[PDB]
Amino acid sequence: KSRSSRAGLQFPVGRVHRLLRKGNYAERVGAGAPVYLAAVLEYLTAEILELAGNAARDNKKTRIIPRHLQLAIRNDEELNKLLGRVTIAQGGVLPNIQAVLLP
Amino acid sequence: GWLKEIRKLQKSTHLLIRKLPFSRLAREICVKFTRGVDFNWQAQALLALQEAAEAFLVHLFEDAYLLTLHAGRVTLFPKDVQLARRIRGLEEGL
Amino acid sequence: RKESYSVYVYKVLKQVHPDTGISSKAMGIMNSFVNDIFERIAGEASRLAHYNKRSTITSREIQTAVRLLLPGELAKHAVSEGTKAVTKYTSS
Amino acid sequence: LRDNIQGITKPAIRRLARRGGVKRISGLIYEETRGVLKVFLENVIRDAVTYTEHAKRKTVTAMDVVYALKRQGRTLYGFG
């Protein structure tokens, strides 16, 4: 009888509703706004986790580390444009060397 | 000749692009985004859009000429504008 | 006595990759990402509601904020998922 | 010319470059400037049309342009 189960989701709906109600955003909150927000958040999380898992599997690993998250984020133009001013700790850089330097 | 032109243009504050071509271009770009419906436009909206666009272009030209002077030339090239857009970092140069 | 999104991220990971684990630092990074996106979307929806002289945040404001914030294909797929979840939730 | 993008003539681009402080320009600059202006206009107009059609209106208002410019990180003071 859960709301997240009623909407077919894994993310919580009541928690997002409470955070919206106690976040100083508006005097009133509707009924479908937390469902919409939880669905969008779960979709984004699933995309990022799938890309990171593919990176870790191609890197011959079994566990995801921040390096895999960095590799997944910086190799997708839309995700890179979304997180354009974010720094990931212990993530490193992409192996990009200028072609003029290499023989 | 060019020196007097620059010195006179840097003192004025009026718009440099005509109104009718800008209006036509903006209207066609706006109708390209919707589903075929035609939207009306206020005059102040088009004026504000033109002001913002011209300010952006002048600032970008200043940055590109800084890059041109760094490269050791006096003539502006498209690669200077491209490098300025790249250094500005995905949010200011685009 | 602290709150996070660890269990839900783990459930999503088990749905996507059934034989893959995750460290603690990556989980902290995921929590930070979720909080950041939540804050952005909620702030944009609040601004939208204030511009049009309204005192309610509905799914329409959330949809418009998602369209304003995310790039093209991400926005399209997010809107699709959101409306799908809404129409599945209102039919129960 | 006939195409609407060709309405931005070379004298106007030359005047903008001269106001910017440029002394000597090349021939390939005008098409690049047209493309950059087109991208800028596309972004701003998309945001403004979204703001306009969120409300149930059919006319683009200067406040929509101001809000789009502000949310993109560029504040305009004159038309507030």
Binding site: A46, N80 | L83 | - | E32
Partner: peptide, 21 residues
């Protein structure tokens, strides 16, 4: 260059500072 669970093509950010015809 990659199709995820949903059929969204995930592309690499090749180039964005050059004007393309």
């Amino acid at each position: 260059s990659t199709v995820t669970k949903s059929r969204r093509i995930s592309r690499r950010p090749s180039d964005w500072w050059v004007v393309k015809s």
